[PDB]
Design brief:
The chain is α+β, with helices and mostly antiparallel strands and 467 residues long. The chain has eleven helices and 24 strands. It binds manganese (II) ion (MN) (2 copies). Its EC number is 3.4.13.-.
């Protein structure tokens, strides 16, 4: 097609710009937070990188407290917004490359953020640039909005939308294709414990596993104080690993037993296709004679969290043909002698699920075990009529170059789209490709990247040039 050929003509520029942006470790770090770096050095630097190539290419930019900003492209009354985030999730062990040193092979590019969300953003970016290079007659302005905190708390767009212009129409290239006109409600809360003797066979000293609500933990570590004979615990733990097909290991160190479990990290919108390292370790600890609190902590996990991806053990198993299942992820698990423990849960649900009702019932159920709920942000399900001219306008672009007649459907990602009333999430991913978002060895294919660019090219054209 006219568009695919055009794009190929930029294949090398796109790869270079992407590389640059992949090379920036824009993972949030609150220990370096500053007014200059609200969420740390990384995200800040990634934002400015977008300002650079922008400037390089002649586009005007506008920043907002170094937490988010826009790029201006078009000319006219209306403004098509395109919401990209440039922050990224941390990367764990087991990588076959440096997560933040992009590798580029014949077929793909390897690096954290290739798939979500650096790959798309830029693909989006070159759509504008290409048009502009064509000296087109813009009939609408284009605001590429870049956020730096979307993967965590929404500090980026929350601020951006207090003072800045709200686009008249917009999409986020940061879920799936071929359109995503709806998204489950996203939520996060904590299950916190309470304190409460006689020198048990084992005392749990600490437990850490998992860092982000929106990721399945692939690492878990427990520090255990053994009382008398511990060769049993080792042999047992090593059998536990084998039986469950896990990686991990054990070291006694300063007279203390360090139990470690590797798992498989996966996006939190779906934990069932991953292996929660934290939950398994706790499943294992359940077989020991432990101090009362550790025992209560472990029991809780096994009663409510373990092997319960769809909130089943929480009396929250619920489903809809339209927006799907309720999913519950345990992204954060911590415990210590003084304060522990804590379960951080990422629960998502379809329109119709009564969160508060559910959440409030569970809160009373849980009292007796000495636990309590601590709600975090709660953002409601987001729906845009598949048929809205906007959506059909984007889909047409997908269908013309893909010919996949599939209907726009509704995932549970948690994109930027719901920032706009008719906000939608438009692509990135082809049914064609491996969804390694939030996983190790994350990569994007040249094919996808380029074919995405091309579709973004025709769509943004159809939509801002052609009247
Ligand atoms: Mn994303
Ligand atoms: Mn993400």
């Amino acid at each position: 097609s006219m568009w695919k050929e055009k794009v190929q003509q930029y294949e090398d520029q796109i790869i270079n710009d992407l590389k640059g942006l992949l090379a920036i470790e824009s993972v949030r770090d609150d220990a370096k937070a500053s007014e200059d770096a609200p969420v740390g050095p990384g995200p800040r630097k990634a934002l400015d990188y977008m300002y650079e190539i922008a400037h390089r290419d002649g586009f005007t930019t506008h920043d907002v407290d170094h937490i988010a900003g826009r790029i201006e492209a078009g000319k006219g009354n209306d403004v098509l917004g395109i919401l990209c985030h440039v922050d990224v999730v941390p990367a764990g062990d087991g990588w076959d490359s440096n997560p933040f040193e992009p590798v580029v092979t014949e077929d793909a590019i390897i690096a954290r953020g290739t798939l979500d969300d650096k790959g798309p953003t830029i693909a989006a970016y070159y759509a504008i640039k290409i048009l502009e290079d064509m000296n087109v007659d813009w009939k609408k302005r284009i605001h590429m909005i870049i956020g730096t905190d979307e993967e965590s708390d929404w500090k980026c767009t929350d601020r951006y939308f207090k003072t800045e212009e709200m686009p008249t129409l917009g999409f986020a290239p940061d879920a799936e294709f071929p359109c995503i006109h709806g998204e489950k409600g996203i939520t996060t809360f904590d299950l916190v414990q309470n304190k409460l003797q006689d020198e048990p066979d084992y005392e749990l000293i600490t437990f850490k596993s998992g860092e982000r609500y929106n990721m399945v933990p692939d690492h878990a570590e427990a520090r255990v104080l053994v009382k008398e004979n511990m060769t049993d615990v080792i042999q047992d733990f090593e059998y536990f690993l084998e039986q469950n097909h896990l990686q991990g290991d054990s070291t006694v160190d300063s007279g203390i037993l360090v139990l470690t479990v590797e798992g498989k990290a996966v996006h939190g919108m779906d934990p069932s296709i991953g292996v929660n390292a934290g939950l398994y370790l706790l499943k294992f600890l359940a077989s020991l004679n432990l101090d009362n609190n550790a025992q209560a902590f472990v029991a809780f996990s096994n009663r409510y969290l373990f092997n319960s991806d769809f909130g089943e053990k929480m009396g929250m198993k619920f489903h809809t043909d339209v927006m799907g299942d309720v999913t519950t992820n345990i992204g954060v698990i911590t415990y210590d002698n003084e304060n522990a423990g804590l379960f951080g849960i990422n629960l998502r649900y379809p329109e119709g699920f009564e969160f508060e009702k559910a959440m409030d019932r569970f809160a009373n159920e849980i009292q007796q075990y000495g636990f309590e709920v601590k709600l975090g942000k709660v953002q409601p399900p987001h729906y845009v009529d598949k048929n809205d001219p906007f959506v059909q306008k984007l889909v047409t672009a997908y269908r013309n170059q893909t010919n996949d007649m599939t209907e726009p459907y509704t995932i549970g990602g948690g994109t930027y789209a719901r920032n706009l009333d008719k906000g939608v999430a438009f692509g990135a991913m082809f049914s064609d490709s491996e969804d390694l978002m939030h996983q190790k060895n994350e990569y994007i294919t040249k094919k996808q990247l380029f074919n995405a660019t091309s579709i973004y090219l025709e769509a943004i054209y159809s939509l801002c040039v052609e009247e």
